[PDB]
Amino acid sequence: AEKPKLHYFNARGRMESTRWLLAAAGVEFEEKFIKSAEDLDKLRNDGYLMFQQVPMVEIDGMKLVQTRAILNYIASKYNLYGKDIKERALIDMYIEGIADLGEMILLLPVCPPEEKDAKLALIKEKIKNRYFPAFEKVLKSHGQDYLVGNKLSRADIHLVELLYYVEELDSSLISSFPLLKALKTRISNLPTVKKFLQPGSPRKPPMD
Amino acid sequence: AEKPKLHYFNARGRMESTRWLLAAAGVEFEEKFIKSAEDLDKLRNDGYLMFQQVPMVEIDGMKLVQTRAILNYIASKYNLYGKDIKERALIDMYIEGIADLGEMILLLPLALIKEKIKNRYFPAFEKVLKSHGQDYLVGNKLSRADIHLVELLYYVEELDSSLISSFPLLKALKTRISNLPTVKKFLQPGSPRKPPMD
């Protein structure tokens, strides 16, 4: 059960959703920071990156690249991917909706400054009219504690992670969604997650 | 015993990789084409799209959206996703590199695009075939990675026919998959396969 090793920069970027899932499942890990174009060159030049890029994760004797491959393997290994291929399809539809919204928030600060005001405007519109309504409807339809199978899964974790970034954006956006508000609370109080949210954890700060 | 129903435009777009995978697996399906903005308004008001967008596929009692959710279900049902958890990780790594390179090409409607091909993606898949010398990418058995890579090989071609020239094992994988009976039927005229944009 040796430790998985995360290779990335000292930032949120494309490694942060992997930090959140390993911690919620209670696994302990080490990180390898990248601080220069020289270290990035020795990984590459040493044959560690199949497509010459990070993120990279060493686990169970492998060297994986691509965020979605890293996340799907961990979720299976720790039983966080539902019980059968029909549960996985519901889970897959929900989390890809969440990654579509996350990616726009993620690239927002690299947009052209002359294009910045309209892109932001467009992202709260979708949050309000498309994505937040869709997930409140899911929880209302069955009235249960979790999004799928009445049991904790990766979908609850990736959703709650996104709710925090939205709050940093505009804390009024979640108001009219009381079922979402309460999920955020119940998940943030699980022992493994409450720790990861406490000061001193491997959680990383905004991309100042 | 009802067949899968695919809802999209009459074009390649974001439904074509799904067209390839079901045909390769021998599955007959139906298509309902979107041919006017009002067609798409009725799909929304009747409540068939969880996030108000297509593609959407009806299958085994459910309505699925998001291309990656749709493809993962189909690949597991017809045993084209590996035999265990580690075979699945090599397959996900390969096909998301492929979905990366294909995304750039799809939105194209380049020098950069041509450099990455010749120096990043094609040398990486030639290395994989050379490492074990077998006729398929993973587990010595036909998988979704083989189908998605060959579809891409056909698009890269339309762009520039000399890009593949220095990659002998890729040319040969292209030849053998195309000769599979389900796949050769799909490349023949009269199939659901779609033409390039014009």
Swiss-Prot record, chain B:
InterPro entries assigned: Glutathione-S-Trfase_C-like, Glutathione-S-Trfase_C_sf, Glutathione_S-Trfase, Glutathione_S-Trfase_N, GST_alpha, GST_C, GST_superfamily, Thioredoxin-like_sf
Pfam families xref list: GST_C, GST_N
Residue positions, PTM N6-succinyllysine: 3
**What GO molecular function terms would the record report?**
fatty acid binding; glutathione peroxidase activity; glutathione transferase activity; steroid Delta-isomerase activity
- Recite the UniProt keywords alphabetically: Acetylation, Cytoplasm, Isomerase, Lipid metabolism, Oxidoreductase, Peroxidase, Transferase
User: What is written about domains in the entry's comments?
Assistant: The C-terminal domain may form a component of the hydrophobic substrate-binding site, but in contrast appears not to be directly involved in GSH binding and is not absolutely essential for catalytic activity.
The chain positions of domain GST C-terminal read: 84-196
Q: What is this protein's tissue specificity according to the annotation?
A: Liver.
Q: Which gene encodes it?
A: GSTA1
Q: Where in the cell is it found?
A: Cytoplasm
Outcome of substituting residue 70 to A/V: No significant effect on enzyme activity. Reduces protein stability
What's the effect of swapping residue 8 to F? Answer: Decreased isomerase activity
In the UniProt record, the signal sequence range is none
**N-acetylalanine: residues bearing it:** 1
What catalytic activity is recorded?
RX + glutathione = an S-substituted glutathione + a halide anion + H(+); prostaglandin A2 + glutathione = prostaglandin A2-S-(R)-glutathione; prostaglandin J2 + glutathione = prostaglandin J2-S-(R)-glutathione; (13S)-hydroperoxy-(9Z,11E)-octadecadienoate + 2 glutathione = (13S)-hydroxy-(9Z,11E)-octadecadienoate + glutathione disulfide + H2O
Sites binding glutathione sit at 8, 44, 53-54, 66-67
Q: Which GO terms describe its cellular component?
A: cytosol; extracellular exosome
Please explain the role this protein plays, according to its UniProt record.
Glutathione S-transferase that catalyzes the nucleophilic attack of the sulfur atom of glutathione on the electrophilic groups of a wide range of exogenous and endogenous compounds. Involved in the formation of glutathione conjugates of both prostaglandin A2 (PGA2) and prostaglandin J2 (PGJ2). It also catalyzes the isomerization of D5-androstene-3,17-dione (AD) into D4-androstene-3,17-dione and may therefore play an important role in hormone biosynthesis.
Record-listed E.C. numbers? 2.5.1.18, 1.11.1.-, 5.3.3.-
Protein name listed in UniProt: Glutathione S-transferase A1
Per the database record, which ranges form the GST N-terminal domain?
2-82
Query: One biological process GO term for this chain?
Result: prostaglandin metabolic process
Q: Source species, please?
A: Homo sapiens (Human)
Activity regulation behaviour: The isomerase activity is inhibited by S-methylglutathione (GSMe).
Assembly and interaction partners? Homodimer or heterodimer of GSTA1 and GSTA2.
**How is the activity of this protein governed by pH, according to its UniProt record?**
Optimum pH is 8.0 for the isomerization of androst-5-ene-3,17-dione.
State the similarity comment.
Answer: Belongs to the GST superfamily. Alpha family.
> What does the organism's lineage look like at the top?
Eukaryota, Metazoa, Chordata, Craniata, Vertebrata
